[PDB]
A paper describes a structure:
The asymmetric unit of the crystal contains 12 monomers of NyxB, but no significant differences were found between them and thus, only the structure of subunit A is described hereafter. The NyxB model encompasses residues 17–134, suggesting that residues 1–16 are flexible. The longest helix α4 interacts with α2 and α6 and is connected to the core via a loop containing two short 310 helices designated α3a and α3b. In particular, a β-hairpin formed by β1 and β2 packs against α5 and anchors α1 to the protein core. The association of dimer 1 (chains A and H) buries a total of 530 Å2, while dimer 2 (chains A and J) relies on fewer interactions burying a total of 400 Å2.
The translocated Nyx effectors directly interact with SENP3 via a defined acidic patch (identified from the crystal structure of NyxB), preventing nucleolar localisation of SENP3 at late stages of infection. By sequestering SENP3, the effectors promote cytoplasmic accumulation of nucleolar AAA-ATPase NVL and ribosomal protein L5 (RPL5) in effector-enriched structures in the vicinity of replicating bacteria. NyxA/B are two Brucella nucleomodulins impacting the subnuclear localisation of SENP3 and subsequently of other nucleolar proteins such as RPL5 and NVL.
Author numbering:
A (entry chain H), B (entry chain A): 17 to 133
The structure:
Amino acid sequence: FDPNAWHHSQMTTLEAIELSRSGGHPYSSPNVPKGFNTVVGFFFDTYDWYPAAYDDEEGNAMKDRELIQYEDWCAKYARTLGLEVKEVEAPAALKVHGIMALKAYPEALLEIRLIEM
Amino acid sequence: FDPNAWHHSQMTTLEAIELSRSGGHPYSSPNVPKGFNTVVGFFFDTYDWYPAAYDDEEGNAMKDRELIQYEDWCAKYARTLGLEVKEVEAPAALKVHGIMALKAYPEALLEIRLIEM
């Protein structure tokens, strides 16, 4: 374990630790229109991120079987319900895995899937 | 057994039995636009109705605690999501309790609450 190593969250290990202790996370997208969020963003806005969360995935949250399911569900119901879906820039921690952009869904839809079910 | 005694579903006892045996129910509304349905309509379109279902309520399905919850849920999320909500004529089995109209929600919204949850 090295303190100075670059963490897969695209910051120093120390910075990752400070970020997690402050209740933050690295997976928020920039310039997300108000009332929208990405699945991964809303998930860690709700639940706690800890630096070792995606060690096995080398930081690629979008390999999480849990988050993939949520993403598939949100895509499905936003379409059948005629909801607006926005495209937003991926966070650096996902840009480094080849994900350039993410779908952002209405927060009410995320609330149903991520909190109620 | 009186086959011609009036059932609270607003048909003869015999008629209610025959309707139940054919997989029908008395709680559908007339002239519901395609892709919409009421809570009570969708519920019994999904699950089996039997004549004695609402003996205790003298046929007022909208006194069912479950169905009240589903209705409250759909009104809440239809509003927050900005979904279209239509007003439709109540079926006779509810007009007899003073309910003149029911709210009709998008079928996708009903699928979530009544089947997935």
